[PDB]
């Protein structure tokens, strides 16, 4: 599945709440299984902070 068609059916954007990230998945690299954040390509410009998600943590594009 190429770009514009990568649809992570079961992995929701924490920032806008789309339940499976379509286009490309932006995975939260440092966040743990409990707080297993993900963003959509509309949303990965975000750099929020929680108890565990941080400005020091990393985002990763997924093209499959």
């Amino acid at each position: 599945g190429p770009l514009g068609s990568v649809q992570h059916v079961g992995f929701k954007c924490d920032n806008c709440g789309i339940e499976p990230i379509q286009g490309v998945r932006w995975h939260c690299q440092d966040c743990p299984p409990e707080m297993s954040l993900d963003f959509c390509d509309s949303c990965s410009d975000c750099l929020h902070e929680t108890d565990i998600h941080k400005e020091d943590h990393q985002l990763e594009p997924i093209y499959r």
């Binding site: 059916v9 992995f11 929701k12 924490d14 954040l37």
Partner: peptide, 12 residues
């Protein structure tokens, strides 16, 4: 955020 459960294949 994960929304799909892991492939546990037990206690459905």
């Amino acid at each position: 955020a994960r929304t799909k459960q892991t492939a546990r294949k037990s206690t459905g």
